[PDB]
Design an enzyme around this catalytic site. Structure first.
Site, short mmCIF file in Angstrom:
data_model
loop_
_atom_site.label_atom_id
_atom_site.label_comp_id
_atom_site.label_asym_id
_atom_site.label_seq_id
_atom_site.Cartn_x
_atom_site.Cartn_y
_atom_site.Cartn_z
CD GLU B 294 60.48 -51.34 -2.55
OE1 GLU B 294 60.63 -50.37 -1.79
OE2 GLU B 294 59.37 -51.62 -3.05
CB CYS B 328 57.75 -51.56 -7.70
SG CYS B 328 58.10 -50.03 -6.90
#
Ligand code: B12
Ligand code: B12
Ligand SMILES: NC(=O)c1ccc[n+]([C@@H]2O[C@H](COP(=O)([O-])OP(=O)(O)OC[C@H]3O[C@@H](n4cnc5c(N)ncnc54)[C@H](O)[C@@H]3O)[C@@H](O)[C@H]2O)c1
Lengths: 542, 542, 532
Positions: B294, B328
């Site tokens: 990711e 994130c």
């Protein structure tokens, strides 16, 4: 508008017609066979719905079993053709993705039914004639597998849309399966009309638009497939057919920053090449290009002492000589217990000698010819290499390209376990047999395991349950799909998904919902009904 | 043996503790916080079950909010350490893969319960101390998300195993979800102890073995995670922890022919670099290496004229300033209708100025410090950049001081024109840019957001008006992955907001759904035919 | 080796072939009938995969409808044979139980398909020849029911494995369906090839090993069944065939401490014998032996005034005279309302007289002969008993002749007041005494019962009044059972719901254990109530 939670029709595998003498499908096939062979046509690009020849080199499509007989003529796509194809895809994107899923799905459900009925023998005949398939090979491919891909893909997609998350208290979570941004580049092989039709239509179904470059020797069936889809209502520009060798198409497609993915078949080296290209040039693309496909391979069969001789013989003849060994993989290597070879060895060789390859419009032939001159030369080289190698040409080995690209069923006898590196250099009717002592079954499984990196499928022939289980254990990683007491072969849709050669990463290829997910980009949506109005957390209190 | 078709326990999200004053968990936490802080330890490699410091340079792990205080000392892994970890992973492979799924599952279910009970405040405190998280941020991460990963992945895996094909008449088809051949390299970031724990364990669940290189500043919690997993019964060599900067580890892992996959986080450019490398060198590897990960990003919030001002204010403060903006992704850009700004602008700025960042052992603080010196410098650069920029004004915050901890204050930038996305990605910290737009230009602002955002992981609309909500869902459909309605846009809860990713990305196979566990498997079909053909001739040949 | 949660194929009842004239199954059948009749074989024991004639006395197996024609010859098991069969079972146990369920399942799935295709007419022919079945009776028994038993048992077994418990928080509960400790003893009757094949294979499926003792008159089909299983891949010693009368076999098996269970179908006479024998030796067995089976019985049909006469007449003929009345139960008593008897009595008698019993290789015959001389005798005794009784009139048939086959004609008796064979007793009662006749049937054992009535109150009255008078009840059809459709039953008071035809049977061949793992158990023993 519409207020509903709808279902798609439940799919089942399409029945295989036999084309027995006196059957009505046999009569209809002969009509279509004659209609296609007697009236060759221009094979044009189809770009934004309009059918045209381009300015590139004219290349004939011929019958491989009778290469003086022309089926049609295409033009090799120029860079400008390719650019037009891409602009057509992008231009059709908005209206195609805005259609509800059900309306897009109906196009392919309608196409499936058109193929099942009124188009059936025409697509089969086109496949027979262009790709040199027997009617049975054409029926399981151009008819049944393509129909199955369409109906099961529609069912797969509907199942995907229904995968939804948990909603906690005070909220509502949903998942939206978006289509990709940009166009998909489908590149399809000669081997199957079904793959040819499926690689471009599977991303289309999910709301994407497509440029499609089929293999030259399959282009007659490809073009008719394109016509069929149009008759089913596929809007113009949703799929764009460009014919030829693909060189100019690849120059254009891989330079376009809107390239969203490539759907293809190819070797590990081809994958690696595309990986290196996309990685090196990643900053050029709006999206991260998705590379989805499968490889070919060569397969093995091992017979235990408890193997049924006739089942083994038949598995070997069909596995190695169906479609002249030109499926995505074919059986190249047999490992047969000595006592079993004593019982069916002569029969194998005799049946191979009698097996008929010829003009496939003669329905009594078992099969046809190799696909083109290039494939023919590689088979001759492998045969000659076998003659001189210290291995015996037990039967066959004859070849003749004067009228068609014909190569006879060939059985090689290798004193030692046959080296895999040699069988992967051609695709053709060449079976290598190694006879091993009954008592060395476990040793031979280890040799198979140790020496097989390129098998898609493998099979054990054995009635003995321990021997079956030992093979399942010991060869667990030596091939993808594995077969017990049958020929290892191509998958029926919905019955043998997945697989691949040792170490490969191709479980997202056609045949399961995983393939369709590649053509989507899921997002989560969360709504909170009464969200917080103070940012302070409980732990912060005095 | 065993004769059963077993079920795994049904997963539910692990409850979040509040650590409110007088709560027992708060008292336990204080015990743990003092224990870890007052007793710094060696932070060794864990290779084949053996805990060893190596010969590489010693690197201190500290409290980012008080960087004079050591928590431990690791040794930078050498090539020899990395080689030993690979060999340990390959040694452990056979026994681990041969364990029945249920026994492998039990390990991680047990680890989940250990972390939920006896290990809870210790792992939380470790994350607090090392990564400078408030207890709430530690709790949703190190405790709840990691626990949810384990329990939900065990359920996901069991659901995968149950996906089986159709059997036609006369046959039996089955699917075998094999582990990969070779080791998985797991590289984990500082941001989450949960991600740090999940990337190496998820492949392990499916029968693989792993080398795990955690982020230096997360290594206290990672080492204790490793101890937890041993206490739960993880056999030695199944996961192998190598500490340090990862340079030598990558040298060895990417040169080893047995590299089966990499489980990581990183930028598009990192993905490209790994794609380039693996493609260029594909011939070196036994398997096609699988690259699963990711990316990070920076997020937006748009407020319609009908937005609830208190809701918007809370979502902006938490979205931009939770964990000092170091998730994130975090909220970097807010687009707020003029009339809503009149109502909550002053309150936003005032709350932001009052927000306390400090030592997180003082639980009354909202948050802590930035993760290290390098991240601090990037924030300073962004603040000085803004100060000198004509477009933007520092409305509140902007103060920074690295003398005791890496502290940067919550900062609001007022931008006359819509904030250029390219500026907000050069740092991760508590920097929120606000653009005030005229109420009547809502759709225009949506087009601006859409046109100018390529790096949003998530996006949110604040609006009570249903047309306005629906307009945002449509118009920004592709401008972010996961999208939020009347709440802060942030990190998903496991099983509630799967998938996502930034525009054009291809990361739906990341952690959070069954798709991730399928990447650590290689499915094969098995077909047994009960009464196969004994003659090869086909009906059409008659 | 596998990481999977697999499904077994979905079972459907096998279609019955009609064997009509000019059909291809008819041609294939004639070939098999000739091949079996013209080439009699030895019928050996099959022990540890070894096909051996024994030292016991030779016993011929003949065609009951032509008892001079030998089909084969078996040897009567000796104590040594029985002991060898037990050791072979126990020696094979470990590798069989260690096979995964799917691999054991495949054997019987493969057998089912082999029986449906390449072996179909051979097995059917063997059942026609040895047991004197018409081709229809053979097809629904030796072919369709045996096939169904294998495919559905595989499905039943798989659904059992899936029956699992709830896990509370902090734990994981699982159920393991173990096989039994020791060998299972299967004893099977002459009536059905399907039952003969199911009783040993069903326990085998769950991972047990077996000694199988078939009925002498069925041993041709049983031996071929054994060969078919081997051709399907059954490992040696998992099922061991011992031929004969079974006296020596029981001597050994019931004395052996490792006896785990007995699977039987036949008379309650010989099950009392074997029930008892365990009753004494009980302290000797390692495991509590599991006695599972079913016994016979005889059926009634009651026809209400609203009965359809053609339906009733057809139900009586087939119910009483299919397979010469030798199914596990036959219609032997009918209770017919006066007005209904007026309408179809003459036709019943006429049809019964024309019904052709004969050589079943003559496919025009309705049925064949009785199974053996012992059976022939008991019918004659019954016929002659009816002649000599006052209240009983032999309205049709009653003839017999054992000179070439064991033939007994279809026979209808008429009684003024309320063994296996084609004998039907009819009692005619006045329409308005329906409920009293129900009382009479209730008070007067019976496996199945049937009411023939269009009237719904009448139907429901019978269902209610005879609820406990029979175990399987039928409405407007003959009571003559199909796998997965009419399971269970048993005569009044019997305890046999665990017999073949449902998952409950396969559970008798398992011992289930629970497995509980606790992730974070208590580390102190004191309880909250103990604090001060
Ligand atoms: C990689 C590659 C190869 C590889 C293919 C497999 C591999 N990776 O190891 C090898 C390394 C085999 C190769 C060989 C050659 N190719 Co080259 N190949 C390429 C390249 C860069 C990419 C093709 C690709 O992967 N497409 C993606 C896949 C999914 O699509 P595809 O349709 O299945 O591609 C297949 C065919 O293109 C075929 N192929 C590749 N090259 C050639 C050349 C010819 C004449 C033919 C008939 C087929 C063919 O191999 C691919 C895999 O099956 C292209 C560039 C381009 N514009 O296409 C050239 C390119 C097609 N090939 C070219 C040339 C000159 C050659 C070689 C003569 C010289 C050489 N050694 O490179 C030989 C000829 C071999 C032959 N088949 O006759 C030229 C064609 C010029 C022309 N005729 O118009 C191209 C266009 C590059 C260029 N402009 O110089 N190359
Ligand atoms: C690609 C790469 C980079 C990239 C990274 C992003 C990109 N792809 O555009 C850029 C291009 C950013 C880069 C920069 C530099 N790096 Co560099 N990087 C690499 C390489 C080849 C692969 C790293 C990788 O992708 N790992 C896989 C990912 C998934 O794991 P990861 O742990 O998350 O990797 C991260 C870190 O390695 C970090 N990183 C990369 N390089 C460096 C260097 C330093 C000093 C630090 C602290 C971090 C760091 O970036 C990665 C993504 O966040 C490695 C070789 C190797 N053996 O690691 C070097 C390497 C680590 N970097 C090196 C060097 C010398 C540099 C530079 C000083 C000079 C330069 N421009 O090349 C700068 C310093 C940057 C800094 N942050 O301080 C040396 C380190 C020598 C040493 N000190 O022991 C290496 C070992 C080899 C090399 N030069 O080819 N490089
Ligand atoms: C034939 O079946 P039927 O319906 O006429 O009824 P039945 O009960 O007489 O026969 C059923 C089966 O039990 C067997 N049997 C009877 N006594 C036995 C004994 N003591 N030991 C082993 N087997 C014994 C018979 O041989 C037959 O195989």
């Amino acid at each position: 508008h519409m207020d509903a939670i709808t279902q798609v029709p439940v799919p089942a595998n399409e029945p295989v017609h036999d084309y027995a003498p006196k059957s009505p499908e046999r009569t209809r096939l002969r009509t279509e066979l004659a209609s296609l062979a007697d009236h060759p046509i221009d094979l044009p690009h189809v770009i934004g719905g309009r059918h045209r020849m381009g300015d590139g080199e004219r290349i004939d499509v011929v019958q491989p079993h009778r290469h003086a007989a022309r089926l049609g003529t295409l033009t090799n796509a120029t860079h400008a053709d390719a650019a037009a194809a891409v602009e057509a895809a992008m231009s059709a994107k908005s209206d195609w993705a805005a259609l509800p899923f059900d309306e897009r799905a109906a196009v392919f459900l309608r196409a499936a039914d058109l193929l099942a009925g009124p188009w059936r023998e025409k697509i089969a005949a086109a496949t027979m004639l262009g790709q040199s398939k027997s009617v049975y090979q054409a029926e399981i491919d151009a008819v049944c597998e393509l129909i199955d891909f369409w109906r099961f893909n529609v069912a797969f997609a509907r199942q995907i849309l229904e995968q939804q998350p948990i909603s906690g208290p005070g909220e509502w979570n949903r998942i939206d399966y978006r289509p990709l941004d940009g166009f998909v580049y489908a590149i399809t092989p000669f081997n199957f009309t079904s793959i040819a039709g499926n690689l471009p239509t599977a991303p289309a179904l999910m709301g994407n638009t497509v440029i499609w470059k089929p293999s030259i020797t399959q282009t007659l069936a490809a073009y008719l497939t394109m016509q069929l889809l149009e008759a089913a209502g596929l809007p113009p520009g949703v799929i764009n057919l460009v014919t030829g060798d693909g060189f100019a198409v690849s120059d254009v497609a891989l330079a376009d920053p809107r390239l969203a993915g490539i759907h293809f078949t190819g070797s590990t080296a081809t994958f690696g090449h595309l990986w290196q290209w996309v990685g090196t040039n990643i900053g050029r693309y709006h999206s991260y290009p998705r590379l989805v496909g499968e490889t070919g391979g060569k397969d093995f069969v091992v017979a235990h002492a408890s193997a049924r001789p006739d089942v083994l013989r038949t598995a070997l003849i069909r596995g190695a000589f169906d479609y002249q060994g030109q499926k995505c993989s074919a059986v190249s290597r047999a490992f047969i217990a000595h006592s079993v070879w004593q019982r069916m060895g002569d029969e194998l060789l005799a049946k191979a000698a009698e097996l008929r390859y010829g003009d496939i419009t003669d329905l009594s032939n078992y099969g046809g010819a190799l696909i083109d001159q290039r494939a023919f030369v590689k088979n001759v080289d492998a045969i000659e290499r076998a003659k001189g190698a210290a291995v015996t040409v037990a039967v066959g080995g004859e070849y003749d390209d004067s009228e068609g690209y014909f190569v006879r069923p060939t059985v090689l006898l290798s004193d030692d376990p046959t080296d895999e590196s040699f069988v992967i250099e051609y695709f053709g009717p060449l079976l290598s047999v190694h006879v091993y002592p009954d008592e060395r079954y476990e040793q031979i499984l280890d040799v198979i395991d140790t020496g097989s990196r390129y098998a898609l499928t493998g099979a054990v022939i054995a009635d003995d349950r321990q021997a079956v289980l030992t093979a399942l254990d010991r060869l667990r990683f030596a091939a993808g799909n594995f077969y017990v007491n049958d020929k290892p072969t191509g998958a029926v849709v919905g019955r043998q998904p997945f697989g691949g050669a040792r170490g490969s990463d191709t479980n997202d290829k056609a045949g399961s919902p995983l393939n369709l997910l590649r053509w989507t980009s899921a997002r989560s949506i969360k709504e909170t009904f009464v969200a917080a109005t103070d940012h302070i957390y409980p732990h912060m209190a005095v």
